[PDB]
Amino acid sequence: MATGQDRVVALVDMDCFFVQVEQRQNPHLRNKPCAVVQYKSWKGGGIIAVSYEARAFGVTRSMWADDAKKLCPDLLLAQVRESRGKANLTKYREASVEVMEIMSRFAVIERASIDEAYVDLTSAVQERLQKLGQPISADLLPSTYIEGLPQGPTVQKEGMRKQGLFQWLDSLQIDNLTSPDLQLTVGAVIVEEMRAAIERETGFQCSAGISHNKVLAKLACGLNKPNRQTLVSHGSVPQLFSQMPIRKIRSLGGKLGASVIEILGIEYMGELTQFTESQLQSHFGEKNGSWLYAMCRGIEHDPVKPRQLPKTIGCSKNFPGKTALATREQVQWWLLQLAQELEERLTKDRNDNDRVATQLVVSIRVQGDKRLSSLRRCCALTRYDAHKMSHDAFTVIKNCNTSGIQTEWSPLTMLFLCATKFSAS
DNA sequence: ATGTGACGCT
DNA sequence: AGCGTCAA
Ligand SMILES: Nc1ccn([C@H]2C[C@H](O)[C@@H](COP(=O)(O)OP(=O)(O)OP(=O)(O)O)O2)c(=O)n1
Ligand SMILES: [Ca+2]
Closest CA relative to residue A403, chosen from A412, A390, A413, A391: A412
A130 & A176 share domain = yes
What lies within 8 Å, CB to CB, of A362 at 6+ separation is: A376, A377, A378, A379, A393, A396, A397, A416, A417, A418
A312 & A424 share domain = yes
Residue nearest to nucleotide C5 (CA to C1'): A254
In Å, how far are A9, A230, A256, A312 from A141, measured between CA atoms? 17, 10, 37, 38
Identify each DSSP E strand in A3-87 by its residue range. 9-14, 34-38, 46-50, 76-79, 82-83, 86-87
What lies within 8 Å, CB to CB, of A74 at 6+ separation is: A33
A101 & A198 share domain = yes
Q: Which residues sit opposite A314 in a β-bridge?
A: A418
From A268, A303, A338, the end of a domain falls on: A303
**For ligand 1, is residue A120 a contact (CB within 6 Å)?**
no
Angle of helix A328-353 relative to helix A386-395, nearest 10 degrees? 130
CA–centroid distance, A102 to ligand 2, in Å, is: 17
Q: Is the dihedral of CA A197, A173, A236, A234 positive or negative?
A: positive
Q: Quick check: A361 and A418 in contact, CB under 8 A? A: yes
Got the DSSP string for A104-121?
HHHS-EE--SSSEEEEE-
A170 & A258 share domain = no
Count of structural domains within chain A: 4
A264 & A326 share domain = no
Does the N-terminal peptide bond of residue A150 adopt cis geometry, omega within 30 degrees of 0? yes
Q: In what order do the strands lie in the sheet with A34-38?
A: A46-50, A34-38, A76-79
A132 & A262 share domain = no
Which bases of chain C come closer than 7 Å to a protein CB?
Answer: 1-8
Give the single-character DSSP code of A138: G
From A42, A64, A85, the end of a domain falls on: A85
Q: Quick check: A125 and A115 in contact, CB under 8 A? A: no
CATH number of the structural domain spanning residue A78: 3.40.1170.60
- Domain range spanning residue A183? 1-15+86-245
- Which nucleotide is the nearest neighbour of A319, by CA and C1'? B1
A43 & A178 share domain = no
Which bases of chain B come closer than 7 Å to a protein CB?
Answer: 1-9
Q: In what order do the strands lie in the sheet with A9-14?
A: A109-110, A116-120, A9-14, A206-211, A229-231, A144-146
Specify the resolution in Å. 2.8
Q: Quick check: A51 and A69 in contact, CB under 8 A? A: no
Closest CA relative to residue A141, chosen from A120, A126, A157, A158: A158
**For ligand 1, is residue A241 a contact (CB within 6 Å)?**
no
**Contacts made by residues A124-131, CB under 8 angstroms, sequence distance 24+:** A124/A187, A124/A190, A125/A8, A125/A183, A125/A186, A125/A187, A125/A190, A126/A177, A126/A183, A128/A186, A128/A190, A129/A177, A129/A182, A129/A183, A129/A186
What lies within 8 Å, CB to CB, of A354 at 6+ separation is: A424, A425
- Residue among A61, A99, A227 to mutate when testing ligand 1 (max atoms within 8 A of CB): A61
A308 & A421 share domain = yes
CA distance A357 to A350: 9
Residue A213: exposure state from Cβ atoms within 10 A (0-12, 13-18, ≥19): buried
CA distance A275 to A256: 17
- Give the number of whichever ligand sits closest to the CA of residue A112: 1
Strands A116-120 and A9-14: antiparallel
CATH number of the structural domain spanning residue A294: 1.10.150.20
CA distance A404 to A135: 79
CATH number of the structural domain spanning residue A345: 3.30.1490.100
A181 & A253 share domain = no
Collapsing DSSP to helix, strand or coil, A96 comes out as helix
Way the structure was solved: X-ray
Size (chain A), residues = 425
Q: Quick check: A224 and A205 in contact, CB under 8 A? A: no
Strands A86-87 and A109-110: unpaired
From A67, A85, A103, the end of a domain falls on: A85
Identify each DSSP E strand in A158-255 by its residue range. 206-211, 229-231
Does the N-terminal peptide bond of residue A73 adopt cis geometry, omega within 30 degrees of 0? no
- Dmax of chain A from CA atoms? 80
A131 & A208 share domain = yes
A9 & A24 share domain = no
What lies within 8 Å, CB to CB, of A32 at 6+ separation is: A51, A53, A76
A152 & A201 share domain = yes
User: CA of A324 and C1' of B1: distance in angstroms?
Assistant: 12
A199 marked as binding residue: no
Q: Quick check: A8 and A184 in contact, CB under 8 A? A: yes
A115 marked as binding residue: yes
Residue nearest to atom 5 of ligand 1 (CA): A48
* Other beta carbons less than 10 A from residue A22's beta carbon: 24
Q: Quick check: A318 and A414 in contact, CB under 8 A? A: yes
Q: Quick check: A347 and A384 in contact, CB under 8 A? A: yes
Closest CA relative to residue A325, chosen from A361, A364, A360: A364
Residue nearest to atom 27 of ligand 1 (CA): A48
* Other beta carbons less than 10 A from residue A418's beta carbon: 20
What lies within 8 Å, CB to CB, of A170 at 6+ separation is: none
Cα torsion A388, A394, A398, A402 to 10°: value is -170
Angle of helix A277-284 relative to helix A255-264, nearest 10 degrees? 120
CA distance A388 to A372: 26
Give the single-character DSSP code of A54: T
